Amino acid sequence: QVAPKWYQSEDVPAPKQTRKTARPQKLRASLVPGTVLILLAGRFRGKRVVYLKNLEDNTLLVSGPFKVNGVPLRRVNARYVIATSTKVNVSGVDVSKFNVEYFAREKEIKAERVADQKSVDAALLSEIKKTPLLKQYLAASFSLKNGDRPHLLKF
Amino acid sequence: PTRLTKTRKHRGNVSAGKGRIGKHRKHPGGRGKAGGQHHHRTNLDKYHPGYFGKVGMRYFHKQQNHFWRPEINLDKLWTLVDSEKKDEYLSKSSASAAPVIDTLAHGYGKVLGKGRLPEVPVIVKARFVSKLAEEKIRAVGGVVELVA
Amino acid sequence: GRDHTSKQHVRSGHRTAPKSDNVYLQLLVKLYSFLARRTDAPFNKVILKSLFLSKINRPPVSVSRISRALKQKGAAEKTIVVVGTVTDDNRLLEFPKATIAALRFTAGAKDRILKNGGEAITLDQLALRAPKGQNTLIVRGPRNSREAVRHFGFGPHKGKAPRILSKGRKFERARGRRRSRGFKV
RNA sequence: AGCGUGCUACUUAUACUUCACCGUGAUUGCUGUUUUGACGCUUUCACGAGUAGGCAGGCGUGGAGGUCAGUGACGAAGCCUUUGCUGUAAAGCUGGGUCGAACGGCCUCUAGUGCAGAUCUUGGUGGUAGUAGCAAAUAUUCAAAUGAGAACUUUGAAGACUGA
RNA sequence: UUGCUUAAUUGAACGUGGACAAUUGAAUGAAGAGCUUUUAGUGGGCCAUUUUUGGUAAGCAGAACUGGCGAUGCGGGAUGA
RNA sequence: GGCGAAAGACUAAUCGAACCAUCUAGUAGCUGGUUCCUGCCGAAGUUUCCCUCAGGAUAGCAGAAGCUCGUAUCAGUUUUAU
RNA sequence: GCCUAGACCGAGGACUGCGGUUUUUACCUAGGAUGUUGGCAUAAUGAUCUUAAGUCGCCCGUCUUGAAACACGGACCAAGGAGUCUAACGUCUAUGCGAGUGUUUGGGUGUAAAACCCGUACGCGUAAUGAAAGUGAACGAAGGUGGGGGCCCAUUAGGGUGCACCAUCGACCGAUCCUGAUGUGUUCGGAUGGAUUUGAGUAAGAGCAUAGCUGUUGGGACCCGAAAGAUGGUGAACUAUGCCUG
RNA sequence: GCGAGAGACCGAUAGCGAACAAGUACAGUGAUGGAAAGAUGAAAAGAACUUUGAAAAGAGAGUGAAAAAGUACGUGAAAUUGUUGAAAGGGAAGGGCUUGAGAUCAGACUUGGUACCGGGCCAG
Ligand SMILES: CN[C@@H]1[C@@H](O)[C@@H](O[C@@H]2[C@@H](O)[C@H](O[C@H]3O[C@H]([C@@H](C)O)[C@@H](O)[C@H](O)[C@H]3N)[C@@H](N)C[C@H]2N)OC[C@]1(C)O
Ligand SMILES: CN[C@@H]1[C@@H](O)[C@@H](O[C@@H]2[C@@H](O)[C@H](O[C@H]3O[C@H]([C@@H](C)O)[C@@H](O)[C@H](O)[C@H]3N)[C@@H](N)C[C@H]2N)OC[C@]1(C)O
Ligand SMILES: CN[C@@H]1[C@@H](O)[C@@H](O[C@@H]2[C@@H](O)[C@H](O[C@H]3O[C@H]([C@@H](C)O)[C@@H](O)[C@H](O)[C@H]3N)[C@@H](N)C[C@H]2N)OC[C@]1(C)O
Ligand SMILES: CN[C@@H]1[C@@H](O)[C@@H](O[C@@H]2[C@@H](O)[C@H](O[C@H]3O[C@H]([C@@H](C)O)[C@@H](O)[C@H](O)[C@H]3N)[C@@H](N)C[C@H]2N)OC[C@]1(C)O
Ligand SMILES: CN[C@@H]1[C@@H](O)[C@@H](O[C@@H]2[C@@H](O)[C@H](O[C@H]3O[C@H]([C@@H](C)O)[C@@H](O)[C@H](O)[C@H]3N)[C@@H](N)C[C@H]2N)OC[C@]1(C)O
């Protein structure tokens, strides 16, 4: 068997200096805060939610509202969502303190999360009832019926 | 050794390097110098002109010893002087005391005239000598002495 | 596909290293490879390629040829360089005081060089005392004086030596060599 | 979905373009850091069809000099095996089973050194196949004995034949 | 310079010395040019376009130039040197 | 060699020349075969001579080894002139 | 000029370069991919074996212009099975010595077919040419001219010296043809000068020896294969014919 | 022929034809032609005894380090064959490429560092 030599060193070289400076994501023009969304995957696929905020980890902040749908304040990824034409004015919704660390990992839900769900859903439900049938639209799941062509459909 | 031969490399190849069409056979063209005048004329006339025929006279019972006569040239003549005394002889030889070179005793039969001698008298003893060789020896003040 | 204008994968056809397995020749090759790589003096590249040569491509150099090289106008003080063996010549009447650098000296050649007050040195010594080959003169031996060369290109009217094992009146002097025996080529 | 003609898109070769990797040929540089590999390391570019044939680098076998103060009855060699690993490949190594006395790596030397063929040699074994077949010469039968066993032996009783 | 040549101081051939230098006297290209040794197989060929001979003709016989097959896979002509 | 009322019959399953051993591994321009891998290069069926025509030698085509040099003067091509 | 939808790839591994923004020896998209998050590690992930499906795939070897062939060998398996050794050679390469070279026929010696040592001859080389008798290699810096690497002087251009090798004009030795001095065993000798002649020659040696691959010739000659030819023996128990006795 | 010593030789299809009761067995009237065939185990300790069977044998037992050594005897390949298990199958079978399914194999939670740090693999 061929023995190793002295010149077969085991030095692990350092990597070269990478020139890949990361720079901000640009979202779709249709993802405006307040837009009603359709969830395309996950536990809550088919649910229609309200888009609230763009978090700094590239995700989207959504809420059912939880009283309407059963889906709470949580993050979703913009590639797994359909942005519709329906818009709700959320300009009076207080979503300042929702950041990445809010959904940081540590079943039972912390009391603060319940309180914030109540607080946000309050103003949300305030604005929703101004649009007729909007609440019942948000309460109903989305699905593709026979003959529905997503390439021909406006959302 | 057999491990370096192309026989080892030809293993696994059908014809062993002898061709499929030609098919290495026993003696195509004959044996030895067969057909030197017929189908091997194109070889013999090109590479061995003079091969066929007789030239000159026969000599029955040739004895090679009759013709023993090794040649030595003038430019090599001084190698026969004693090497320990060569440098002394060159500077001191004259018409009264010149080195004696016994060419026959050293195994030579004739002295030939190629090259140049030192400008030093020499007594050269030889069975035979060429015409130019003796002139060059006599020109450096030496002499040729015939022996038998 | 390619319409090749020349033959593909052609080795240069020049020897890039000695075929010799002598370790000291390889030491000399190492030295002159460094010298040719780091000096841009043409002498070192010439010496490098010369060390690769085969035996017949390094004919022996006689001391008489060396002394005739030293009689060139202005060459009496040059360092004579032979990549090969320097042999003695007893036809030489006199030999001067000279510095000769060679791979090998025969005993007589070395004795003759030293007796006249000269210097018989090796190629590493030459490199040390002339790293650019200053004041050197390269002498090469006669390549075409080899006996094998007499028989190269034999053919009608070529005037070359036939390949023959015996010499005499009965050996290839008849038909084809004589108009009295047919023809003469 | 025929024939003549014009058009738009579209389909896909081991070809072309860019990239990766292998090899070959060339090519950049490499000693006060050459430092125990300079037959090495390293920069860059182009190229790759092949019978007959040439050359090169390698793989494997018997034996020989040297070496590993090498393996081995606590199991050498051989053999069997979806236990796996390495190599483009020739091949090399290993797990398990079988087994019983020697054997291997490395540097070299050497040859009676590698098989699918030659109506090849010797030995062994299949399909064919439980197959072709065991049909000339008139012809056998009952009972008893013996015996583990009787169409086929012996005895008795018959029926026959050879027909001097 | 010459022994050749001219009636000749004419010539012929080869020269000394001096002048012309990167447009050194068309293009395009050039994995560079030149030289040598040595030796293998091969020495049954066949096909296509064009030219072409004998023949009623032939997947016939025989020449010319080139490209191929032989020695070659690959995509297409269903299949096919 | 025998033998043949003759067929080239018979001469120990052998006869247009028995059997046995040896010379003898007789010679074959002819048929068959010719044993591991990868890498690089890569043909010819043409010239001349041959009792040559299923074979050779010779040149060509191919490989290998290089050697002398380093842009010199070369080209299966064009242009101009002839 | 701008906006916008997909796919494949991520070779390299401190820095070094070219540019850009200049806010500054800083930063950049500028000499080849990074950031972040989830899941898993009793597992998705990969590899092989068997099998199904889709697609393609004629039997190898051989001679041949052309083979899957209605051309030949091959039922199967194991083991054996075919370019060898030698004499003498060509080229090339390695090695030792080198105008020399080769100890090994033999002798000495021995730890005994080894290793170690020794030298006379001899072989090949150092001279060729002619059928032969024979003769036998410097006019000259071993010549002139044109190229020629390297070296030297210079300073790009230029000048000098130029080994190997090449083209060319000469010179020397032997053969051939001519000329024909002094002299003589008066038929010898051959000075000297000439010739579109000729040599496997000279012109500052290159060889000898060992080994290796390849090529050549003689040998069984890569392996197996005739019909034949020869020498010396054995058969008339079958059968042919004569004879003897039944 | 007789007596010795050796080998880079062959190793039971090799080496002499013959390693063995080999010029043997056998063939041909004859001259002549001419094989195959080595190995249990250290030691026969070569299996007493019981039982089934006409017997050969079998099953127990026993000897032995081993009976996966039983005088069909060292190891015991392939062709070919039986049984068992798995799988496939409309006028052959076999092969390459690709993936599925079933089986097998393999790996980083590292030789991990002091509950945290940090790492491996597959993915958005
Ligand atoms: C002007 N003289 C023409 C000469 O030019 C030549 O013409 C060829 C002609 O024969 C070729 O045509 C040829 O080859 C094609 C095909 C195989 O290429 C065949 O289809 C055709 O039948 C055949 N005649 C054609 N393709 C090009 C012309 N220059 O040959 C024919 C000719 C009459 O001598
Ligand atoms: C210089 N030219 C000479 C030419 O003259 C000739 O020379 C001859 C020469 O052959 C003669 O010499 C001849 O005859 C003598 C004999 C007579 O002794 C022989 O010894 C010699 O071998 C032979 N060559 C010589 N005796 C006279 C010269 N001129 O030889 C040929 C040549 C070289 O071309
Ligand atoms: C007697 N006349 C001579 C004429 O014969 C010739 O001389 C040749 C000479 O050229 C030959 O020489 C020729 O051939 C030799 C080779 C054979 O060695 C070469 O070395 C040489 O270079 C070559 N020129 C020489 N071998 C013989 C003379 N007679 O030279 C011219 C001349 C003077 O007219
Ligand atoms: C340096 N002096 C040289 C001297 O050494 C010698 O040189 C020869 C030369 O003449 C030879 O060359 C000669 O012979 C060859 C031969 C092949 O025929 C021919 O080229 C030609 O006849 C002639 N030039 C050459 N082959 C070797 C040199 N050493 O010849 C005389 C000389 C030219 O003066
Ligand atoms: C019992 N039958 C006898 C018998 O003596 C037979 O012996 C063989 C014997 O030779 C074998 O033994 C064998 O051993 C090796 C190896 C290949 O096995 C062989 O190379 C060797 O020739 C042979 N001794 C043995 N394994 C079985 C017995 N029947 O040999 C002859 C025979 C007549 O068949």
DSSP symbols for C14-71 = S--S-S---HHHHHHHHHHHHHHHHS--HHHHHHHHHHT--STTS--EEHHHHHHHHT
Give the closest residue to A76 by CA, choosing from A53, A95, A97.
Answer: A53
| Chains A and C in direct contact, meaning 3 or more beta-carbon pairs closer than 8 angstroms | no
Amino acid identity for residue A127 in this structure: E
Q: Are B96 and B141 in contact (CB under 8 A)?
A: no
Q: Does C161 touch chain B (CB under 8 A)?
A: no
Write out chain B residues lying below 8 Å of C156, CB-based: 46, 49
Nucleotide nearest to B14 (CA to C1'): F34
Of B47, B50, B118, nearest to C154 by CB-CB distance is B47
Q: What span, in angstroms and rounded, lies between the C-alpha atoms of A62 and A73?
A: 6
Specify binding-site residues of C for Mg(2+): 113
Structure tokens at C50: 């010369």
Please report how many Cα atoms fall inside a 13 Å half-sphere around the Cα of residue B128, on the Cβ side: 12
Write out chain B residues lying below 8 Å of C155, CB-based: 46-47
Q: How far is the CA of B115 from the C1' of F68 (A)?
A: 33
* Residue A128 neighbours by CB under 8 Å, 6+ apart: A65, A68, A88, A134, A135, A138
Rg of chain C in Å (alpha carbons): 22
> Is the backbone peptide bond immediately before A65 cis, with ω within 30 degrees of 0?
yes
Give the closest residue to A53 by CA, choosing from A71, A78, A70, A85.
Answer: A78
User: In sequence order, what are the beta bridge partners of B126?
Assistant: B146
Q: How far is the CA of A1 from the centre of ligand 5 (A)?
A: 41
Nucleotides of chain E in contact with protein CB (under 7 A) are 30-32, 34, 36-38, 40-44
Size of chain B, expressed as the number of residues it contains: 148
Residue C146's alpha-carbon distances to B59, C56, C141, in angstroms, are 35, 8, 11
Identify the helix (H) or strand (E) that includes residue C126.
helix C123-129
Give the closest residue to A69 by CA, choosing from A37, A30, A105, A116.
Answer: A37
Q: C-alpha B56: how far from its chain's center? A: 22
Q: What span, in angstroms and rounded, lies between the C-alpha atoms of B121 and B103?
A: 16
To 10 degrees, what angle do helices C63-70 and C107-115 make?
A: 40
Q: What span, in angstroms and rounded, lies between the C-alpha atoms of C163 and C166?
A: 10
C61, C63, C68, C69: CA torsion to nearest 10 = 60
Q: Are C15 and C52 in contact (CB under 8 A)?
A: yes
Q: Are C156 and B50 in contact (CB under 8 A)?
A: no
Of C162, C169, C185, nearest to B56 by CB-CB distance is C169
Of C91, C164, C176, nearest to B115 by CB-CB distance is C91
Residue with token string 């490199």: C127
Q: How was this structure determined?
A: cryo-EM
Pairing relationship of beta strands B128-129 and B110-112 according to DSSP bridges: parallel
Q: Does C185 touch chain B (CB under 8 A)?
A: yes
Q: What span, in angstroms and rounded, lies between the C-alpha atoms of C184 and C170?
A: 16
Q: How far is the CA of A57 from the centre of ligand 4 (A)?
A: 92
Nucleotide nearest to B19 (CA to C1'): D52
Q: What span, in angstroms and rounded, lies between the C-alpha atoms of A64 and A88?
A: 12
Determine the protein residue whose CA lies at the shortest distance from the C1' of G128: B71
Q: Are A70 and A62 in contact (CB under 8 A)?
A: no
Q: What helix, strand, coil percent values describe chain C, rounded to 5?
A: 30, 15, 55
Resolution of this structure in Å: 2.3
* Residue C185 neighbours by CB under 8 Å, 6+ apart: B45, B49, C156, C157, C176, C177
Q: What span, in angstroms and rounded, lies between the C-alpha atoms of C91 and B76?
A: 6
Q: Are C75 and C94 in contact (CB under 8 A)?
A: no
To 10 degrees, what angle do helices C42-51 and C23-38 make?
A: 160
Across the interface, whether the CB atoms of C93 and B116 are under 8 A apart is answered yes
CA B46 to chain C, closest CA, distance in angstroms equals 6
Residue B107: Cβ within 10 Å count = 10
Separation of first and last alpha carbons in chain B = 56
Q: What span, in angstroms and rounded, lies between the C-alpha atoms of C58 and C15?
A: 14
Separation of first and last alpha carbons in chain C = 52
Nucleotides of chain F in contact with protein CB (under 7 A) are 27-37, 40-42, 44-45, 48-52, 55-59, 63, 65-70
Separation of first and last alpha carbons in chain A = 69
